[PDB]
Amino acid sequence: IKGGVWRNTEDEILKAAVMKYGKNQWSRIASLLHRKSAKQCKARWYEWLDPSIKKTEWSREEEEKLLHLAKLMPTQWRTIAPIIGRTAAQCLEHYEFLLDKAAQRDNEEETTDDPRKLKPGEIDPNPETKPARPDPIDMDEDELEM
Amino acid sequence: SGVENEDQQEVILVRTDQSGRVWPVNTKRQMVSTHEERERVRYFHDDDNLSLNDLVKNEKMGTAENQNKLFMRMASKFMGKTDGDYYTLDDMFVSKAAERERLGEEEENQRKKAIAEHRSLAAQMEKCLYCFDSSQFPKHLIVAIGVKVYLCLPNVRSLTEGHCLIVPLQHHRAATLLDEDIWEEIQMFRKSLVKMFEDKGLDCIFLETNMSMKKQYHMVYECIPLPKEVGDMAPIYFKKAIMESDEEWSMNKKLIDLSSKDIRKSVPRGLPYFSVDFGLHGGFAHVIEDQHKFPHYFGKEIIGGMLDIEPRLWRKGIRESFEDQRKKALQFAQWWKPYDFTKSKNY
Amino acid sequence: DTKLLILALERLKEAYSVKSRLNQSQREELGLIEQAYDNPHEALSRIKRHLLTQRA
Amino acid sequence: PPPLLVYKWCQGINNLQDVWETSEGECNVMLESRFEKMYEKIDLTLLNRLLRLIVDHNIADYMTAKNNVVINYKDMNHTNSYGIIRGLQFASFIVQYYGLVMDLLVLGLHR
Amino acid sequence: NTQELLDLLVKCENKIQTRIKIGLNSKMPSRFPPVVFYTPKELGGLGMLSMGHVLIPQSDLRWSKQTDVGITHFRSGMSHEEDQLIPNLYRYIQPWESEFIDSQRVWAEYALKRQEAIAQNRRLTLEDLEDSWDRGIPRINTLFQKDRHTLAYDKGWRVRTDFKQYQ
Amino acid sequence: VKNKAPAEVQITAEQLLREAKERELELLPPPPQQ
Ligand SMILES: [Mg+2]
Ligand SMILES: [Zn+2]
């Protein structure tokens, strides 16, 4: 009964709580954010809020090094990720994107073979890698009390 | 006695004990003086108010705790430290005999206990499937009505074909808590359901799961018919699985036999007892300690494994069509037409 | 596959059977076990989806 | 059960043809050892190759990528880039199959 | 067959008894009654199992009752003997060679029993069961588990229960 | 009636710090002119 999508209010409280408590007290930070736990705060920090995480567009030499290492160490994104300098979720996402941009060009054109294989009626397994919902104009009692 | 106008009404403040008896409830520490000239003459603050007849009364009405009320108080914080010898928990218990705060004992007993019990009971009654004038109460799963007990059908997909329930009118929480007039009428429904399923070629297993007796759950007496080639193998399954239930190295010697002792005079009034009876012959009973190593179902799981049914049936149920699929009551009522004993108006 | 799911959940719930003092992560684990008992095909769709897609 | 295993091993030694005869000069040798750092030294790329021999490539990629996690204890974090996590649910299968590969190394394919 | 392990068992048993005694503080001096340890847990005892040579004193074997006539002194085991020495557990646990000889026997005998019980057309009864209840390689009472049908898909479970130590 | 709608202001951490400093929950008042 914890987790869910990260909103912007929670991220700004997470940043201020990092500024007060540091990167080794995640259970003091997670008492400041209800509906998020210490592991989730830490995961969210290291995967989307640490200011070393290059959120810009991938270059050419980065994706060349990516294809080299991903052919070179199969499914080892926690090992590849500090070498090419991106988060392993970003790294895996962009690798699957580059594979989709060539497997499409080899056989198919737009569509045709299996319309949807996406994920309905489910909870996303890693919402920490996703951007923050902006804050809804009529904030409820939870957000204002938080 | 106590009134406590619960939002308009009047409720007679009463307390239940462990044994399910219901008693009427009538309505900075100063370290009193627990000595005399050099000699100790009383321990607690009221060792000279109580008379012998008063002790007999308070021993009968008094619930079976009397350690807990003192241990709750002396377990709390800001209260020193037992330093091995010279100040143990013994003379700490001697030193905690204060001068309770001008009928604060009756205040905490009445307010905590009466209000709490009533509040819990009311909640249970409101959301009880049983006790006719409640909130949920399907009312079309009723097949029978008696003087004091009635047949019902379960609110969920109903594990087997003729799965039915023997429910009393009021909350009573146990079969050992029942009076003989209710129990002898549950035995008549039992002896009629056995004779109904025997001529249909089925067999009967009557379950009674009674968990912790302080959450006020309604009594319900299961009846699960399964075919006779499986019901002759049924005491073997329950006999194997009662002894590979509860906390190992238990005290009370698991699997009480009920061949001729029929739980009313087998399990003492007050303590949980899962029980299972096979048809008309009594089966087994298991006094439950350790309420985590024993599921609240336990009987539908053993029956559901010997019939090879999926676990969504016995735990949490599967709901049905709220009027349409629940007209298995129509199918059950044409089964229970020759064996009805609750009427004579059939001219 | 439902038999394998029941066996998996029994092996997971045998862990938190001895004890009774559970923090948030244990509570989440038992809640996911109870959801997997109460709706097995959603859990099997989720398991097969993790086996196809997730690599981090 | 392991005592049944010891009993079966004993009577299997007994039921070898002329096992106790030492007339023309014969020796019976018993060797007991371990695979010392077997867990600690599994290469994850080679493990990916062997699991793609066994199971679907999606399953093999899942099992390989699951061993490459971040290990945390209070102040400490690092990445399991080389060995395998013994604490995985399916690590039993990885251990028994990599052990099968090295049984093939010790015995040889003919024996 | 190992004397060092029997001596270790005696020493460890005395250690946990001394821990209970220090829980009552009791003192260094002996003649703490061993009936409080080794009584079964249903009569209020601790239920403690023994694997050592402990004897009870003869002064513990006195009891009495007050009937209508008066008080009657009854006594247990008095002829001349000192043979009151805590039954120990090796006598009550079947060895493995006995188990392995017995288990093929009881499984073939149960096979014959349920084969003749299905041609004589009656379901199997608690008595014929109770003849061979606690005997077998997988223990004949495991035919009557709550779910034998979903445990038939449970393969490789031994290595699993050995590797649960890392979990 | 509550309306979910994407906003314009988008509160940040430095605004939280500014509003936390202005609470003054350690600044005791000066003693009175005696
Ligand atoms: Mg201290
Ligand atoms: Zn009710």
Secondary structure of E56-109 as H, E, C letters: CCHHHCEEEEECCCCEEEEECCCCCCCCCCCCCHHHHCCCHHHHHHHHHHHHHH
Residue extents of the structural domains in chain A:
3-53, 54-105
Amino acid identity at B95:
S
Q: Cβ-count burial of B149 within 10 angstroms (0-12 exposed, 13-18 middle, 19+ buried)? A: buried
Query: From CA B205, how far away is CA B226, in angstroms rounded?
Result: 8
Q: Cβ-count burial of A49 within 10 angstroms (0-12 exposed, 13-18 middle, 19+ buried)? A: middle
Interface D-E, measured as beta-carbon pairs within 8 A, has a size of: 23
Contact C51 D59 (CB under 8 A): yes
CA torsion sign for B324, B325, B331, B333 is: negative
Q: What is the CA radius of gyration of chain B?
A: 25
Query: From CA B152, how far away is CA B173, in angstroms rounded?
Result: 17
Phi and psi at residue B204, to the nearest 5°: -130, 140
Instruction: Please report, for residues A130, B71, B167, C46, the alpha-carbon distance to residue B178 in angstroms, rounded to integers and kept in the order given.
Output: 60, 33, 12, 49
- Chains in contact with chain F (at least 3 beta-carbon pairs closer than 8 A): A
**D12: part of which helix (H) or strand (E)?**
helix D2-14
Q: Which residue of B has its CA nearest to C7?
A: B311
DSSP-H helix ranges across C1-56? 2-13, 24-38, 40-53
E and A touching (3 or more beta-carbon pairs closer than 8 Å): no
* Ligand 1 center to B181 CA (angstroms): 60
A74, A78, A82 ranked by CB distance to D45: nearest: A74
A9, A19, A138 ranked by CB distance to F11: nearest: A9
C40 contact partners, CB below 8 Å, separation of at least 6:
B312, C2, C5
Distance, CA of D63 to chain centre = 16
CB atoms within 10 A of CB B169: 15
User: How many CA atoms within 13 Å lie on the side-chain side of B61?
Assistant: 13
Closest CA to B25 of B125, B113, B119: B113
Amino acid identity at B180:
E
Residues of A in contact with D65 (CB under 8 A): 75-77
Query: From CA A44, how far away is CA A51, in angstroms rounded?
Result: 12
Contact C2, B310 (CB under 8 A): yes
Residues facing E71 on adjacent strands: E66
* Ligand 2 center to B318 CA (angstroms): 21
- Chains in contact with chain E (at least 3 beta-carbon pairs closer than 8 A): B, C, D
A8, A12, A136 ranked by CB distance to F4: nearest: A136
* Ligand 2 center to B51 CA (angstroms): 41
Closest CA to B259 of B285, B298, B232: B285
Q: Which ligand is nearest to the CA of B172?
A: 2
| D62 in contact with C, Cβ within 8 Å | yes
Q: What DSSP character marks residue B282?
A: E
B293, B311, B316 ranked by CB distance to C6: nearest: B311
Label the pairing between strands B202-208 and B256-257. unpaired
